[model samples]
Target: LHLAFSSWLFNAKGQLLVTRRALSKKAWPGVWTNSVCGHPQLGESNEDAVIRRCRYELGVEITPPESIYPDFRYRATDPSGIVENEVCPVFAARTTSALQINDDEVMDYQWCDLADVLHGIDATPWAFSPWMVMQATNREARKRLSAFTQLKL
Candidate 1:
């Protein structure tokens, strides 16, 4: 599998940032997922990839990302037959500016309570990315997600 990363952003109000995948995406189009998911360039660290992608995907500045679920990974297929197969790590960051949505990568977004997100995922995990549900539901990852939600930028 290829390497990738997911970024979970939290605001001062402790709300988590989630975004809908662009309809034009090759896989999982229009599905809500974490703040940003991306691939690291040559020699780029995972945390750096988080920062870099927010600039493209969310068009917002973010505080440096902190690793939470370092070993996260998953494989899933889309209705159109595109598949997501990656060894994707997870990270958390705080936004430093208002979001400037990039329709090429994201179609919509929400800033909501992390608990509510988990509740919804439990009730209807199909509404979200498999990787997000898997990572956020994991024991260590969930703990770190709670910890990051309360952390200040």
Candidate 2:
């Protein structure tokens, strides 16, 4: 089984950091997705992998991330028949740092309110990554994210 990590990064203003995958990507090219995501190098811990990915993909250092759905897993197939079958643990982190996106991984980005994100998901689910859609539609995931957003820190 492939192991991976995904993050739901939020800014101090309570906006979710969302990104569009580069059109050059093999899977889900040009689709919108969560903050940052990547596979852990062999022998690397999940937390370290996420931190490294955030820095590598967005040029931002994050606070220690809180694992939101440690047991989350999904399998998806792209239009090109490439399969993404992984046990992907989800994490969330809050950061106020400026972003310097890596062009090879991301094409564009935006900080949007949770409500607006949900509305977009409802209206155009096909435009989003499969894992993102799963998280948005999961009530338990939503509750956990909501609680995190209420934290003063």
Candidate 3:
């Protein structure tokens, strides 16, 4: 499977950062998803990749990343039949700066309460990327995400 990384970012106010995928993306374009996602270069850690991707994709510096779903993986196909098969570990961290979204990577973003995001996922799963639903639906991962939202950092 292709190795990738995904992250959930929170702010000091405890708002979760959700981003919409760019229309130019190969899969699930225009769908709202986890904070940032990316592939790590050879020899890079998932944690490092999360930080690097957060900057590259959203122009934000995040706190040290922590595993939310250390073993998360999924395979999904977009409506166009493009397949995304990945071993994408999920992480959570807090952003330390304002966002400067790269239009090539994201089209829109929202900072909402984590609870609202969970509710939205529950109510309208189709509005989000498949992997976001898969990772956030895991009990342990949901627990970790909740903890991050409550964290004052």
For each candidate, what TM-score against the reference? 0.93, 0.94, 0.96
Q: How many backbone collisions does model 2 have?
A: 0
Please write out the lDDT profile of model 1 over residues 1-153, one tens digit for every residue. 899998889876778998999999887888999888889998998888888899988888987788888877788887777877898988887888989998998999999999999999999998898888888889988888897668564
Stretches of model 1 off by over 4 angstroms after superposition: 151-153
Candidate 3 per-residue lDDT, tens place, 1-153, comes to: 899988999998788999999999887889899888889999998888988889899899988999888788888999989988889889999989989889998999998998999999999999898888988899999999998877583
User: Can you rank all candidates by TM-score, best first?
Assistant: 3, 2, 1
Error of 1 at 123 (Å): 0.9
Winner of 1 and 3 under lDDT: 3
Question: By lDDT, highest first, what's the ranking?
Answer: 3, 2, 1
Give the TM-score (vs. native) of candidate 1. 0.93
Leading candidate by lDDT:
3
Q: Tell me the whole-model lDDT of each prediction, alpha carbons only.
A: 0.87, 0.87, 0.89
User: Model 1 — which ten-residue stretch has the worst lDDT?
Assistant: 144-153
Question: Candidate 3: misplaced stretches above 4 Å?
Answer: 151-153
Candidate 1 achieves a global lDDT of 0.87
Instruction: Record all residue pairs in model 1 with backbone atoms less than 3 Å apart, i.e. clashing.
Output: none
